[PDB]
């Protein structure tokens, strides 16, 4: 009754090769974004209908080999922007490969494409209702947490004092409950209403709390704010918020949604019973995990050159080799173990660990060095590297 229609989401996980040296910024929606409106060219109506997950952020440089995930969501009714999406997208061959397509809920590949399935308001209903009934104890906190998609872009109160860029929320105080759930009512009735006694009921119905915040703000060389924060829920609460949450799981909360921007994602509580709902964990994530990055010989190899300065090596080198190597296949295998600390003498006594555990996590530290510098460089918490002298002192 919250919303007495929807339209029927639908999706597609496009997983793509690189044949090509390609580097990218530190978010991928812009860069994605430009890619559909080069091909499609549709005009107007691909802000009504379609929309962007980019699962990748944060990697930025790219090589041949690395493959690339995301999805594209539609809304409406006998709709055909998928048909000419997979006509044209099919023959994409270069720069951009093509590995394969999946349809987002049924999981099968994209083949035998006459229609596919869709996330029809009652089942979002559905999942929320059950999801409800087998985790109400009416006694419990319920803390679920809130991860971003790194941007988002709200008006604290919807102020019009402040008149400018200042009207964004940027820190945890301006995150008012009441403020988020009419956010996320606003752009629910939108969507509807482009196919009040409700808008006073949700006032009321605030039991939920925002804890342990960590949110700050990203300007892309646009504006944004990024982080995560515990939201805990009260036992009085219906399922018809949960409905509202789960719906705008997909759809998006804030300004400019079109360009993909104001996504989140919430992992529950753990030792819950297993039910998935919507949109699945394993399905929207990086195509070569960080991991796979990590056992990747040239940045072993790399990692090698740059710890064996201070190495002080005693023992030979080719079991050194050797054990690295099985290590890999270890990891790979997802069954490794680290060492335990060892504490030698230099004068002062130092614990290191042996020395092919200290490679591995130098070559950790190599694959995750670009991404962190990039994101203290563009955030509020950042480094001033060219200090201005008068400033400073």
């Known amino acids: 009754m919250i919303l007495p229609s929807f339209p029927d989401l639908t999706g597609l996980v496009v997983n793509l090769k690189f044949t090509a040296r390609a580097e990218f910024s530190l978010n991928h929606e812009m860069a994605v974004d430009a890619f559909l409106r080069h091909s499609l060219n549709l005009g107007e109506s691909y802000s009504h209908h379609l929309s962007i997950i980019t699962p990748e952020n944060g990697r930025l440089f790219y090589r041949e080999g690395d493959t690339y995930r995301f999805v594209v969501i539609a809304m409406g009714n006998q709709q055909q922007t998928n048909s000419i999406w997979h006509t044209l997208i099919n023959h994409l061959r270069k720069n951009i490969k093509l590995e394969s397509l999946n349809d987002l809920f049924d999981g099968i590949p994209v083949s035998s494409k006459e229609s596919l399935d869709a996330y029809t308001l009652q089942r979002a209903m559905e999942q929320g209702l ?28 919807d102020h019009k004092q402040h008149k400018g860029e200042q009207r964004y929320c940027r820190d945890a105080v301006q995150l008012t409950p009441l403020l988020l759930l009419k956010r996320i009512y606003e752009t629910l009735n939108n969507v509807a209403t482009y196919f009040n006694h409700q808008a006073w009921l949700k006032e009321q119905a605030q039991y939920i709390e925002i804890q342990h915040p960590d949110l700050y703000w990203i300007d892309t060389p646009l504006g944004g704010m990024a982080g995560n924060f515990t939201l805990s829920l009260k036992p009085g609460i219906e399922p018809g918020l949960l409905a509202m949450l789960i ?12 360009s993909g921007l104001g996504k989140y994602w919430l992992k529950h509580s753990l ?13 929207v994530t990086r195509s070569q995990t960080l991991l796979d990055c990590i056992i990747q010989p040239h ?15 005693d023992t030979l080198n080719e079991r050194t080799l050797s054990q690295v190597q099985s290590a890999i296949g270890q990891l790979r295998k997802h069954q490794y173990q680290a060492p335990k600390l060892q504490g030698f ?11 092919y555990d200290r490679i591995l996590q130098k070559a950790a530290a190599i694959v995750l060095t670009p991404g962190l510098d990039a994101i203290m460089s563009q ?8 200090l201005s002298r008068q400033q400073v002192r």
């Open 130 to 157: 059950a999801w409800h009934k087998a985790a109400n104890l009416t006694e419990q906190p319920l803390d679920i947490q809130w991860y971003w998609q790194s941007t988002v872009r709200i008006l604290h109160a």
């Open 247 to 258: 719906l705008t799981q997909m759809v998006g909360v804030g300004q400019r949604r079109t």
């Open 271 to 283: 030792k819950h019973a297993h039910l998935i709902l919507g949109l699945k964990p394993n399905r």
């Open 299 to 313: 940045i072993i190899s790399q990692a090698i050159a740059e710890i064996e300065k201070k190495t002080n090596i």
């Open 345 to 355: 003498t230099i004068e002062r006594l130092l614990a290191v660990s042996p020395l």
């Open 379 to 386: 955030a509020s918490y950042g480094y001033r590297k060219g």
